[PDB]
Amino acid sequence: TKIEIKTSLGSTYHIPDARRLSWSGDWPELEQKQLEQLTSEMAKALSQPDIFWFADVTASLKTGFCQEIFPSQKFTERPDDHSVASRQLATVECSDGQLAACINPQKIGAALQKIDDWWANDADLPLRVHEYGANHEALTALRHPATGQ
């Protein structure tokens, strides 16, 4: 997997191979460095007004012969017809009129904000930020009101 980023300030970043970068650990040289530079652009954008910033993120995937792809799924009613699909996938209309597979904005978003490893003084894996510390995999909550957290 290769990742490439351009921004409105003229910078460009390139990860030659993203498959090994962990949450916890230390990155290889000429990768750790790009993380520092990107951090600076964003740290500013987040807090100082009157700066226009805009980013364009592309990636490439090397695949198998006929590999299956997993786009976002729609939320639906059960059809009563038996001629209508029970599992329907999300697509986007292209400028030429054809449809293409896509991933929804809020699904990209939920991934980007998965940064909370501040709970219970034991980092584990990070959670999607939520007022109550919701844990979807275990169907529970890590900052239950009863704890004061």
Binding site: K6, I51, F52, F54, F75, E93, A134, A141, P145
Partner: protein, 219 residues
């Protein structure tokens, strides 16, 4: 138009005011299905570690591609037609539109998406070049007082569409507990109409009719 005006006004010391706003439609795609709410509601207030879903609504959503032509006016005799102001016009641009998310054209193919004209002849000439499959939306003349009158008007034309136009008051503004800011009033939705005009029709109508009829305002 107004949230955009307020943001720009906090950046430029001179008074800036928007008389009119125009709307053009290049792409319109209907999206099926409905959004799932975040689990923001505890199943029980105390001694329960289960999270419930607030409820579900049935709405309709779409993706747009559109251009705007805003009539900008500066009260002061001396104006600021400079690169600095073009940057400030890019910064002031809101991120929210019609409940959805607004973005500029993609970076890898960027051109000057934020130009300014002080000549009707140059601006109209460039606008006549737009693709034939798009729509300009114009204000209508007809006065309708019922759905039956609307049915007849729509049977006769092919360019006429109903639109939501604003609100009609049920009472005079008063002070009321729970108001976000100042006075509060109840209202019912106002249903009105508009026309859909092809780029080919204004290539022939001329700049005179376009700048007289093609711009919308409040009141």
């Amino acid at each position: 138009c107004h949230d955009y005006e307020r943001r720009l006004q906090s950046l430029i010391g001179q008074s800036v005011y928007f008389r009119g706003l125009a709307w053009y439609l290049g792409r319109y795609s209907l999206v099926t299905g409905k959004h799932l709410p975040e689990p923001s509601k505890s199943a029980d207030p105390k001694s329960v570690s289960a999270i419930r879903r607030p409820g579900l609504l049935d709405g309709r959503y779409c993706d747009l591609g559109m251009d705007l032509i805003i009539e900008v006016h500066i009260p002061t005799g001396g104006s600021l037609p400079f690169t600095t102001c073009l940057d400030l016009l890019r910064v002031a641009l809101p991120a929210r539109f019609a409940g959805g998310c607004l973005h500029p054209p993609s970076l890898y193919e960027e051109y000057n998406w934020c130009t300014v004209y002080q000549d009707k002849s140059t601006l109209f000439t460039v606008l006549s070049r737009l693709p034939r499959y798009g729509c300009w939306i114009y204000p209508s003349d007809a006065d309708l007082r019922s759905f039956e009158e609307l049915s007849e008007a729509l049977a006769l034309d092919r360019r006429l569409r109903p639109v939501a136009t604003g609100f009609v008051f049920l009472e005079e503004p008063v002070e009321r507990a729970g108001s976000i800011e100042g006075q509060h009033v109840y209202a019912e939705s106002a249903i009105g109409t508009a026309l859909c005009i092809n780029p080919v029709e204004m290539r022939l109508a001329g700049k005179k009719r376009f700048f007289g009829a093609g711009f919308w305002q409040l009141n």
